[model samples]
Target chain A: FLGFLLGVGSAIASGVAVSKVLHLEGEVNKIKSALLSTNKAVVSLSNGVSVLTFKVLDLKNYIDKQLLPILNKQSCSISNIETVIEFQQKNNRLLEITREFSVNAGVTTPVSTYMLTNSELLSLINDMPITNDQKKLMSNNVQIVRQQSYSIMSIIKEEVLAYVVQLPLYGVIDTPCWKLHTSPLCTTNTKEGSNICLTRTDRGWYCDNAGSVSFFPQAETCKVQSNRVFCDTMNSLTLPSEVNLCNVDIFNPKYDCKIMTSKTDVSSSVITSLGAIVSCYGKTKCTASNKNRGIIKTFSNGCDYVSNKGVDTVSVGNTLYYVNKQEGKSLYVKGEPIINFYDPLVFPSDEFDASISQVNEKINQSLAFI
Target chain B: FLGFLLGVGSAIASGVAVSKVLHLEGEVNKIKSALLSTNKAVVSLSNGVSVLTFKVLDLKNYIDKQLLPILNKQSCSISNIETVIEFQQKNNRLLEITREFSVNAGVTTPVSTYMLTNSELLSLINDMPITNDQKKLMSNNVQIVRQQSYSIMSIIKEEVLAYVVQLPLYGVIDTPCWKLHTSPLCTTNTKEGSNICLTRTDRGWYCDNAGSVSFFPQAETCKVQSNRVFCDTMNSLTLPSEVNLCNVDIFNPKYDCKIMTSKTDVSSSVITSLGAIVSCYGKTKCTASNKNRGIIKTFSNGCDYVSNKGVDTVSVGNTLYYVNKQEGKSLYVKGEPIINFYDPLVFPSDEFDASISQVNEKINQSLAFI
Candidate 1:
């Protein structure tokens, strides 16, 4: 093994970098798998909706931009992904930081784990079904193993490896990595009425066997290196020592990171810090729950930074919902406003969706009344 | 007050009918509000998503068909919504039963009463922001009240009247009983760059005083009773008595309803029942979980009716994950299977969204590894 591994104590630690990225990708894949195990994972964390939304796109960009060019050259092992002392370490740090930015800021969880509702299960079967012959391939020793919890079970007939999550209006994160099936709701090409035809990204009209398209399955082929020389990739360095990634000592565990609230502002130190973390992840919506000391912080630009410490702002003079007078100090300066809204009533992001939907539904109802 | 209300009780059983619908709508809205309040509410009860889904739609139709027509003429008061006796009894039974279809099935209620999360809030805000001036009108005397929660707290600016919850995918139910803002998504026709601009449904395109087609504020002119006359509609009839609203009660609170699984068969009277309920919700993509005992039931038409009772058929001889040899029974014959999944990993309605997203994220990573 050591003999096969050769170079990398250099200016461009490309191989090592690829390894770290691939390894982190594995971690991400695990989270995705866990989330796909059940719908509640994503549905449960509405605060993380946009987080998951963009994160997937971010990962998509990283994959196409950073990972592929290298993997084509030589297969990087898990050992390489994990044992990145220099380049591997730096890239891994970035990945971890970005993750923590949300996990810490409460943007979205790598995997949202909630109970599997029965309807959700049924929906899975109906939506994601494999063939009888295919189902038979599963082992007979199918005892309920702890399934590594990343739980909330399902019986996907076909092996569903990696996937993305999209909400109707909640969001749609477009990434170049995945083969874009442009028309998710395929119309003409479908084999059957119920069957939603699938189309390969650049490849037109998809079909598994014959013609009539039926959900095209896309498993990309690895573009192998014409001349394999992974042994020249890295010269084996020690795992670099830099645990405090993102250079932010934000979470000490307790008030560790983002104080997820209904509507937070960049008014206070604690808030700004968390806001930056979230905002840095490309999340704009700021939210925090101030127990009481409340005056609505609105941006001079007229954008309202409504901060509700819940009962924390009970003072008589407290400005309930106001815009911050000091506007230019955009929240994401240091980091971004973590869109973590722990409140389940109506999420900060949900505020707009629900409000609009509410208005829309009301309109439809009223219109229907006519 | 009692004297002015003479017409209602003097002849027509106004109180009874109002109770029949509004009270039920209250129940309808409550359940709707409850599920909308948090993903967990619906995630907790899989059977209810569709039960709730169609139920809301059903209620919407009912209001439009029954209540609105009547209300447009005379305008019934709130005092009437609470007085159901005979017809009231029957509908109440159905509402409670359908609710129990999952309530007894299992609806999680841990932190259902926390602040609404930010994503949800922002979604609501960006999606629905009432007029700024009207927004400012809300007094600074904002009080944090728990407000009769089935859980999940929210902020309703000035006053939260009636509201509907729509899933980007699950559906949109029209309810006539909410605040009538008649216009949706329109505030500014183009508030610069990507700012939202909502136009009235009837009015279509609108403009601010500046007239360049900016945020079009539409509070809506209440077309309150173009013709007011209670004695005109319904021809004056007494209340009718009949419960079992949706007319399906597989759930006895004991052996009550369908035992939700990862994949459930359409076979067995109890099994087909739950399947139909799920299928009817416009969700043909259903699934199930089976610890043991699995068989896929397919329709001769090439369509499949697969059901898994979690542990329905558990014998080694059992063809796990395979279509039952004795096929041809479409799950919808009896009562359709209402897609119900609950352990909270992923959600039923959220399945496709999460699944595709997961795949996209993974694909990006995999492609990166090349």
Candidate 2:
């Protein structure tokens, strides 16, 4: 019995040791492989750098000795339209040749683009004497050259930055995943015996009555709905599609619920997740929080939600007159605002209760008039 | 006394009320200003986006319709050198016209460069028909054209990115700053014993030193200086005077210290800063870092300190070397001693340690005897 137990224990111990050794060996191999690969990469990169350095030096030499001389020599003759056209054409050809040289030397297009855009080559064309027609043609040619330069440079810069900085610095990092909400908007009705139905206009299940349907109170418009149509619409509206059910937890409660903050704590998460999403779209990680969320939400909604929320909120006199969450706040859609709603109370209750009281009193007076 | 007190109190009260009113008014004005500014910014951004989008789309269209067709048409004629040259020259003319069109439109030169480079127009030239002589000329022309294209595109990308993303996002807003270190590699050196002496060398300060000054201590070697001497003797070295001295902060301690990890960081900065500086040296705030401390120390010393350090510190059998900070972590100054003389156990420390280890281990081992 003792021998059997010892044998079993040894077997388990050996298995664990072997696994540990294998794991370590794998790690060492990975480091070795990385080092080897990095060595190769560095060699290639060094060669590239050398070639680029040579090309740039050669270009500088050419500009100074060849192109600049021609320009300087023809500065006087540059006043002639034919001379200007000829000079400009030659200059353009030179520029083209420079670009071609860069490509042959394996310099990325973006780098070349940067050189062309920032260089004085194009500006020199303006010095040439040419007819208005010739000038226009020359200018157009210059523009095409510039555009071509930029396109190449932009792509190359993107590629190089991606390779040298982001990839190397950030490591093989995985972007954050987003769980998107795929629900559609709907409308509600205030008329008695109204039932919820899918409205083609609403593009979602909504409460219908009198050929009109109430749109779903989105995350934004519930406040407006509560103030304007909450009492009127709740009595008559009955939702038909279960998908149209509103999560009351998402709404303002009788009590200031801390849980509501947690549920809506989405500010950070949405920003983080959506930021990742936007970055994935842009090919760079979204580093900023608020902007990331805004961008993500904007992209997800097809940049249309800004308009939809504003339309759902309405106001009457000094009081909010909508039936959704957007009450009293400015409503925006598609990067533009549909309604400009400001709280009559300029200050929050925490800052000055009088402002709230003044607004409340004005609202009450307005309600009495109604 | 009582009358005076009353008057003072009235004045104080009136002043307080006026101040409060003014404060409220100021807040309102500020909000208005913010709104207006935001609106203006949004509009500007929207315009920028539209321009970029359209520009990119147009470039793609041009490549598909105009540039590619020419290349495809020429590809078949590549077998006949004369036919290829004729076709290439014709297409080149068309490209020249397209550039003219762009210039006339007032589209930036960089944009044109981008179009040319990324469109792979230069690649099509590889198919150009030409004799060996014509081929050489065409190839040279292609290279220059490609380089120019890359330069323009890079400049545009930098400008756009700086405007749209880097400026507003990072708030590292660029100002018109002077480049002071534009010619760090100039023949002039701030000799320790001499009073800011400037001298011109047949080779620049980095002529031999460029390859040697690794960020890592281990990669530091005298081979770079030796190469400089050899190249100078062979008359194979090329030096340029009046190099741009741009922002010195680019080679900060944080970036330059960890040569291996931050290689890409440095490279990206160099690409953008170098491109900008080279193209817009007189216009932009670009400069090179002051060559006072750290890695630049070795260039003046000829790697004597590195050799001594390696000999004393690194193990006798283990190799030690130094690399340049600009060269990042990849290159080794070949034919230099590998082991530091100071501490014979551990390797010498610096920015290019990892790079030295990799390059030396791979390239040096074989080249050691040679």
Candidate 3:
């Protein structure tokens, strides 16, 4: 009806027969396809959708009768809101949140208006402390959200391009190494030789199965044979377990997520144990050894990372730190490691404490990025 | 960039478009490759999900009528089912897209090449048949009715699979209890055990302490549990007016004992008069084989593969009993000890009588995929 209304008052300047070319601009055909394109788990998708629904509905409520109250800085908890967003984005409870959101957005406002403006969307994206897994999920959805928003993402994307720096990979650095063990019947590249293996701290990538190296930037199990290696710099396990997903970058453990189970020694499995073991396997996070059992076996990712050379490093500003490290015969840091990306900082004991001074300074600078 | 057109009224067919076309070419590849694979999984996964949700709701209805207060277990089924119904959780959805979960991998789709290849599904109650057992002395009458339950299930499984074509990813689908376990006698334990009396009306079973009964057990028993009704078992019961054991049964009650229970006249359940009691001569029980597995089986798609602890993925057939302990075995079904066929009887406090329920309204819509 509105489009019909806009097509009134015919022009009479017909000097000769003529035709006009349609620019096909400033127009869009929106479908309920936003949810269609997302590759999310049921929970993640449910929670995120709920967040989107809440953002629109909550904003509308603030503008309308104020039943649920408004979202604001003083009342907002980013982690919790992020939690809410995540839950809504991916939960069965979304039906309670989204039906009204879809209806109100359609009936209440013009299509040109968005639940969140391009600026708000960018700001939200900017503030989100996410993993590659998360970042990729959100980015894809944001594009669709913009398309649904009647052209926000395209506009914002062009503007934001100037701000993003395109960095080139300088060179391949340290990576994990694995050799196929056929004794237990290896399917070419997927078998475990030993629960604990030995390696030099100088390869580019490693995989879950013992003696494995393969690339899967996406979270998945790799095989025993070497394949194209993908450096997943932004992984959740790299961050401390206590760090909230939206509160910190879990990508850089050495520079940012370093933490010690004790003041004197920081090992891999102790600090890096992600609730259980699988999350700890490929994740190049820090950990601590048992009180008496010694370090090598405890630091689960020790051999995996020790084989990788000092490449695929995460940065605290320009100062890049290697996720996989090398020390005498083991993979334990003497002092406690500080999370270089997030704020959870634990330190080494008053012993040697040689490099503990760099911890505080690194965190302060990393905070600036946020 | 406009085709060579003279503003003064000349027309020509000249075109110059390169980068824009190239950009457009580049554009489609960006989000679509990811989207296509994701939807393939989504398209397949939806079919298996609906059957579970529907069964849960139906069972929930049954439990609500029987009158039980559920606290924790209600959430377990609902929480799990609701996640899939929500349609947004990409984590569960993405798991479907994992290479390791590929349906074509490990096990091909049953090698259906021709007519039988077109796998038709049966949509019987597709929820988890997680029954423990209500076995041993489950009267021959209970035994008589069990086969039809599995008949209903096997047929339903075939009906639903008729339309759906694709297989969902593994670990993403869960179906449960084919049968609901009830007390050996449809009886309940109460602190005041002596107070209550049970009665069976033509409409359904009933239990109440406040109510009185007109009928009595031939053995002078007072209360009646849901003892299996032997449709026409003769003798050993009070009849018309004498209401005593059959004349010759003085020797053996257990063997000559035709399992019989008394029934009240339709309207006046209370013993208003002995004349009314005499009106009820010989009411008896029918022998039954309770081999009913909710009488259903076989969900569409081969993704019903599951692994228990360290075992590899074992595909569950249409019949899903003991998903917990029945691991490593390729095909299985436990015999109901007392009956000729089925199993899974239990205590009410256990997951016995509780029906699995929790489904969003959207499932009916989600079923649009099939």
Candidate 4:
């Protein structure tokens, strides 16, 4: 209404041409329309800002008021559980001390036959100042406290695990969210042996039986079916990765394996067990006395490569191998011992430690955030 | 230079007055300057957007490439540790089965005196079909596996905890990030009693001594020091919370605490202990044989409230209290028993459970993010 009135009045009063006044009025109307649209856009943007602010505030409330408080309390509970376990351990030691004292004094028979059987342990127990009668009472108290502790531990395990399960992933770490593919069991350069008597440590235990190491034989004791070989006389053990093989050298059984025990003190039984399993016949069994044969025995207990040229060396099928100062024998026919890789399924301990540490630190950080 | 040339050319060509033409030129220049400033502001805003975009991409790369892979590997390790534990347990059980068979067949003595003593456990063991000689061999293997498991557990603990420590806070939960303050103990309605024979469960153990339940006496065997009471002849027990009291009844000690044991099957020793501790004298002691006498005894175990008026009622001081069908009683004098509260330092299990669940779930989610 105002525009129409101004347009007519200006046209009537102006000495300028009527056509020029009309054109001027048209320009003013265009600007008014643009301003109206801009005002609408501004209002819309302001509403959006309000919604975003509300969302942020709500999120903050949930984290600060609800989530963090619960997590902190959970931390406290963990501490309390730890303290209880600590207390129980102390109590258990005290009870043991008392019982040992009583037994030495001979006032009563010890509660169980699993008393200090070792000289070192006995000597340690003997040094305590706890009296006999007190020990007798503590012995009686053990079962009661023990039962309670057991109940507490079971509950704690359940409780603690639940907390771990609920924690969100982003809370753990800030970067690269992705799944991991375990590195190949043996790197590209390494290959599984044909009659693979598997490396002992790689399989999580040392070779101790015929079934533990792979060998070909046709004395008709073992049979192959469905990719798995079943041994009748060797029924003493069965591993998950057992495989089937048909052909066999009945007399000269080719044993392809490595003993990865890293001790300078390899037990006689270890050699005996490997020898019996592989039936290495005249091939020397690796013992502390012997250092060289086709198979490799590690004398170092590290995951990293160990080079000790100072130690004696022997050639095993073109690969130069480290050997004990004394002549040592092993079960396998060829190849160096694989580096100390645990089973592929087993996670590395360092990573495990780091992850758990992350959890603890995360909890502390969240608590501190408040 | 262009503006100057335009000015000179326009002035020479225009028939209009020089000053008027110059004024028009000045107005046009002002609009150009305004446009230039707006353009600069636009450029600045665009640069800000570019920086923000780069940051978002970088963060995405980190989450995808590095962090997630490590976390996933850590998860695998956790699974591996669990599997080992599970396998060890199964192996242990299997060994036990064989040992029991050998023992039953009279081929060998049990490894330790801690053999299955309970009739129920023996019956369960007797049902297994493992042969005697197998058990003999398994018995020898037990120590080897057990030692390995112990070493593994210790290493895993260190490794796992390190991971937990490194985890960040925001990844745990998204919200108002903050720490928690524990709710006040016993809330507002409750007050600590004078001559408070402290509630037993509140202190973490059931009352079993005069020292456990606060009492006053003077044939002066106990002494007070630094807010802590030390007992001599009653030297049988000492708790963390033992407090110093300077007064003594010497004989008719006025005990002022409640027994929080929640079992209906109250033991005779519990009553005797309370009776000895408080020296209630001729006053009716609350026992399974004799119920309501001032001191409240709990017959329920939940942390929640329990009410049952159907049981026989008795008046103690002025309050009507419930008694067991068979008379049951407890130790304190003035007030009802406190609710089954664990020690204040001991955190609630539910929160503990939740927090642990969060950690686990976080790992799973982070792995899934990839």
Candidate 5:
């Protein structure tokens, strides 16, 4: 059987003998059937790959148009929070600190009492009175304004954290999955039986089934043997390990540091670590927050206040409506002396100047004539 | 040769003679080679599809985690704008309209003069005058507050528009692209002989190349022929045609309508069409804005005001700090009367009642003694 097979192979390799050609017909038919099925398989794969190319493009478009814009807008996510904090500092001074210096400080006068003892004239029409309805309306209006202001600080913080939690910390590790579409197996013009390589690299993970030339971050390591790159260590392919440099957790108790009265001072270690600006609002004697990376803006009530490190200090002295001193070694009253009236009702004779006395006397004498 | 081939074919079809079988070996060898290549092609496709499954999962995870969260946050995009607008209404009344009624209305008194004729109290010490530096400091303080207010409105509008432009108005049209990963061709256990259909439907666009039973919006018509769904019209597979119902373009001149004095009223057609709440901030006489669907909040500075369509009216009537009347036939003065003081620096003697007369006499008499 071996000698006969060798003779037939030799005959067919050179030229088919006319007498034996008929016997080879059935084997030839089997080859034809195999070719037909192979052709169908190749065509089916080609069509499937074309569809994949379209699907990939769809995903790419979604990322480019949608995801990237959201990523770009992250810069302003905390800006509103910053603006509100700054406003609250000013607002506290306007409402609380400045009031403490006024003549009517801590005084709850009757609604009809307009004649302030400090020579401010008073007038009242007995016929008109503030009704319960009117007072309710006024209270509601005030509440509306205050509510918005108070809720905004929290909303901004909440929204910012919501954005932060979903934030892509390391961002997208640009994968070369799109290159697969351009591979010989994926393309329509490509011939069959040609070698095609598919690769998908994500962050530290470098994965390649066949051979594909691709660029990746140096964190991931792979070896190339001829045409194929081998990635043996998957440990490197995991997500990036790093802290969120710009993230601020407002809910974190460590960040809730404040300026204190009675010579006490507090600092935010997290703010200092991130070199973030710390804003301290409301009445306090001294503040030294955001140590080391000092952009500590202490908005407090006091004349001769001291906050450590070069700071941006906003204070309301007795006569001074506002005092902003920045990049100073420590904040303290410079020229303006605070007039601390020990008692609200008692006007000291020594403090009253000649001009004040003259005006007071003239007004009283004119009223006596009337 | 034909007669000999026919004779050998007949012999092989039934039972090949021992001599003829040897001659059939070469043709059979060609079939073996074809089968070997076909097997390699099928294995390669199986591996390639497995990789596709993973790649798809990666994309699905990205969408599920990232894009949807951003989509959910769009409701608050315009809320900040609304809040600022509301605040600006109150702020304008506080700054512009209320000043028109005060005793110091349009009067630029000297910083040294604190004696208000209306008896609001005036105090000045010639020794400590408001210097140029102090004036600048005061001005800066005022600007910081005003500037923040002014910039915030525009920023909110801009940010809203930024968010609006990218807003998916129709929102996400759920696509079953993930199901492709589970298709016969994609799965590892699936046999090679099974047919796989790939369909990609977007909005109104329905497209299917082969046999895949899939669901799509009824707007896109398709016919089921046994295992395959056929979509013939490419025109049907396009983007949905619809306007953004909630979108408002602030920069559009048509929306920049304002309430004016001398019986001038302006309405927002776009706002009316959308049934959007129109907020009119500033001093105006009458407003009929937001015609049909009326949430027209007319914020003006006048005792007698009118707005059409059961509007929400906010006014400051001399003593009334705030007046918010909603769903009214029209907003106008019910009881409070306007005190239009014709001349500045002139006190109306007739307007003074008995209480005012006695207090004036007492104050004059006391000032004479002092």
Candidate 6:
């Protein structure tokens, strides 16, 4: 009877083992099938990704080459307000056409209207003409001419805030950063040991280290100032408001304010100097009559001049604006007017300007031909 | 010199340790900055996703609840090719109006045109009045009506494919297993002896012990003389020419021929039976006659019996033909001369035939009104 019981138990055990093996085999087959299917799905997904990636890259390259240049040129030529207004108007027309078409076709839904309008706007922008003004503006502002460059930079910082900073890239170099700073007030070091240093912070600029040495340069320091006296003086008397009004405060004062007794006079004098720099930078006073022909020639032919290679005329309204650089001068300097000379010793002609101009002319000519 | 070298090495090791610590600190700071920036970006992405998801869900629900039911009802009311043709012609007028409107509005794009045309067709089918002929036709040919029902089903399938398939939750049901296998087909099975028996497979049923079984009852034995008589009778019958044609040669008797013949017949019969079963499963047929004076009694008193719940109607000219479920069942079994059978059933009755004076009365006389 015990042997019979053992034999029955062994039979049951064998059945159980066989069942388990069968179940496991089935499960293994299912898993293998699933894995194979998953592998195929992954390959399809990879192919889809490759196609999408290629399309995206193609779009990117198109923007970089074709669209970027056009947008950059538009940004250079058109003011922010002008660009915005034009885009808004053109988009409105496109939307109107799209909406009408959609409604006529019987899909009067808002979503369809929106999609059609956007597509039309994209198409219109794609085929927009490249104007001569846009080309000239881009050439004048080479650093600022990039695809969606203004928009990309605007994404980084508000356009209104960085208006002055952006102007320099457009050849408006006379615009001072300090004038663009948040505060108009200038100061001398109030600290006992520290040398007089200009510092900008969120609050404003200080003549000394406010508290810590790590209180570095701030955006406000290079932003616009609100002081009316400085603005008035710079706007009317000394600087051409068109260029100088951008950011007058960023430049360093030639004289040390700590050594001067009257700080107000020093500020006024700096404003006057800035106005003069602005006036000299662009052809502000050089009318069609004077033409500024002799100014460039005088600098080029002078005994102190090493060579006549670097001087050239930047034309504005048929009048030549002469740009010159002197040897041994670190600052970018212009030639002194032969008729109006008060500081003759300081305004000597140099060979560097002619050399620079000669190289620049060749570049400009090549570019024009191309 | 050896001591100096050791000292220099120690100094170098100290410098290295200091630099490593500094680098780690810098990395931690950079990570913190990156996390903050990424958090902001993620928030914006999540906001966009929420908006897109909400809009998609809203559109899907609207199509399912409002549009699909209307389409199904319209499809059921018109089964015959003649009625469908008439409905399409009527629908095209509405579509033309919609197209005109879209054109006048200046919104007629290809997408809008497609959408409008589709919507007009759906609306026309749903709203158009059903004629007596159409009602009679639909009542007679239950198979065609069922096909019409399946067409609506197909339309619903397409709508779901478009709108619901993109949603995270609802799109899960669109898998191949759910679509092909989980439907009504191949839904039953049984087991006999040691073999599991599937009712529906590529090959017809076969016994595990016998390998293949004849479709004739297990108790039946084949006789060549009886088979020859059956074939001759089938060929001589004045059935539709389409059905009378046969590829098999019936006179050449073989033992295994019984097996082959029975299997073929069973397979074909199963297909035909299944088709009929599926056709009648989800539909109701209504029949009524003008000769019956009991029309009012049947409509009001015996409404529930004849209509499967007070919904039976047959149209004759301008007058509606009504019958109770009892009368309907009698008429359906006995067969009505005037009323042709519609196959696919429509629910809520408001879809195709909107001119239901009885329904309005029922609504007005409901307990809620009291």
If scored against the real structure, what TM-score would every candidate get? 0.16, 0.19, 0.16, 0.14, 0.15, 0.13
Q: What are the per-residue Cα lDDT tens digits for candidate 5 across B45-143? A: 211221000000122334346444545764634335435544543344234322432444322212110111111111111112345543333232321
In CAPRI terms, model 2 is classed as incorrect
As a whole number from 0 to 100, the lDDT of residue A218 in candidate 3 is 23
Candidate 1 residues lying further than 4 Å off, grouped into runs, are A1-370, B1-284, B287-370
Who is ahead in lDDT, 3 or 4? 4
lDDT of 2 at B322: 16
Instruction: Please give the CA lDDT of all the candidate structures.
Output: 0.24, 0.24, 0.22, 0.23, 0.22, 0.23
Q: Give the distance in Å from residue B352's predicted Cα in candidate 6 to where it truly belongs.
A: 82
Residue A178 error for model 5, in Å?
50
The Cα error of candidate 5 at residue A251, in Å, is: 42
**Candidate 5 deviant stretches above 4 angstroms:** A1-302, A308-333, A338-370, B1-304, B307-309, B313-370
Candidate 2, residue B28: the lDDT equals 31
- Candidate 4's C-alpha runs over 4 A off are A1-355, A363-370, B1-238, B241-370
| Candidate 2: Cα lDDT at B305 | 17
| Index of the highest-DockQ prediction | 2
What tens digits encode model 2's per-residue C-alpha lDDT throughout B328-365? 12222244322222121121111112332343343343
- Evaluate candidate 3 and give its CAPRI docking class based on DockQ: incorrect
Candidates 1 onward: DockQ, in order = 0.01, 0.04, 0.01, 0.01, 0.01, 0.01
Winner on TM-score (2 vs 6): 2
Higher DockQ: candidate 2 or 6? 2
Q: Write the per-residue lDDT of candidate 4 for residues A160-242, one digit (tens) a residue.
A: 10000000011111111111011111222221111111112111111223334322222122322212233322222232222
DockQ of 2: 0.04
Q: Write the per-residue lDDT of candidate 5 for residues A272-307, one digit (tens) a residue.
A: 111222222123223333335653554333222334
Model 1 TM-score on a 0 to 1 scale: 0.16
Candidate 3 chain A least-lDDT 10 residues:
A180-189
Give the 10-residue window scoring lowest on summed lDDT in candidate 2 chain A: A1-10
